[PDB]
Structures are given as structure tokens and as C-alpha cells.
Amino acid sequence: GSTPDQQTLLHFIMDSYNKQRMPQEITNKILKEESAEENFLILTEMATNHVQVLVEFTKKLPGFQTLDHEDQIALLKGSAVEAMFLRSAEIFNKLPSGHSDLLEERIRNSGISDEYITPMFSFYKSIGELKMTQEEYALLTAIVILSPDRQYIKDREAVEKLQEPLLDVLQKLCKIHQPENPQHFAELLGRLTELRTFNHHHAEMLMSWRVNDHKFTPLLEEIWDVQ
């Protein structure tokens, strides 16, 4: 059973999570537009848009705004790519504005390595197989965003105090909405680490793209520190 002081948290987070959707104008390009250059450019347009979503979400995460201004940036930079993996996963696993088939085909043909694309979809399947709830997507995202063990975090203790309550709620739901299998809570947290493997790759990939004269936006150059 969930407490009323926990109950306020979940509603707040689910409310924050639902309070931002991706513009049709951007997602319409998955349908309408033509090339490997185009497919890449579209993905870039959604990456940029999702950084803003993430920021607006993160601001509404309870207790975030009190954190050290220099820690707040570190938490966003270190978590961006991961949150984007989850959002895509949610879309492909659940969507009307997703266009699963088209979008997948565009991703596949963007001049991006299979070394990276192959595991990406292996991940999407597996996280879809978990038959994950919109609460479980929304809470895991916050948890990821507020991961204390990011690089360049000054005051790691202060993050843990914000993260742990969100884990404690999640463990409650894994027993409530998933009583048969108790390992369900630990299946969710296995992702947190698999999602971390994709960070490591992403920096290597990012270089690959840069040297191929790939152009990115001022917000993505900032979030990933492109010179």
C-alpha cells in the first residue's frame, strides 16, 4: 500500500510527465519527407525538441531546483541520451504520433552504424517485453535523470535524497501491480545499467558523426559538449 505522502509524488510526476508532447509538425516529417541525410536531420530535430521536454520535466521534479546550479547542469548532461532512449522505447512499445514502421526505417537508414543501431532495437524489444506501464516509464525516467553517480557531480549525497524516494515508490508498485514476479522491480533497474552502456557508445558515435561533417543544434552541442 502507498502512503498519501508518496501518493502526492506519483500524481505530481505523472502529471509532469503528461504535461509535454512532441509537436506534430516535427513528427509529421517521419511521414511526409523524403535520403540518409534527411532521416538523420529529422532525428536531430527530435533530439533537440526532447532536450526541452526533459528540462521542463526536470524543473518539475520535486527538490531539483534547490540543487547546486552547477550540479543541475551535470544531471541534465549525463542523463539526456538515456532519457531519449526511454522515450523512444515507450513510443515504439506503446503510439499514434510514433509511426513505428516509418520511424524505424528512417532510423535504420540514417548513416548510423549497425554496431549501435542493432543493440538499440534489441534494447527496445526487451524493454517492451517487460510490458512496462506509463508509471514505470515515467518514474524510471526521473530516477535516471536524478542519478547521483554522474560525472562532475559535486554534492552526490543531495541527489540520493531526491532519487531514493522514487525508487521506494517503484518497488511498491512492482509488488502491487506485479505480485506474481517480485524480480520485476530488479528487471526495471537492469535497464538503468544497460541504458548506461549506450552513453559510453554515444560519445564514440557522436565523434563518428562529427568527422562526417554532421551538423547539430546549439542545444545538443551544449548538452553533449560539442566544440
Binding site: 547542469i73 546549439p218 542545444l219
Partner: peptide, 11 residues
């Protein structure tokens, strides 16, 4: 450094 994320965090 990081003018934009700040701007977005303070809007």
C-alpha cells in the same frame, strides 16, 4: 559556459 540550459531552466 552553458548559457542555453540555464536560460531554459530559468524561463
Amino acid at each position: 559556459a552553458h548559457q542555453l540550459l540555464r536560460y531554459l531552466l530559468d524561463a
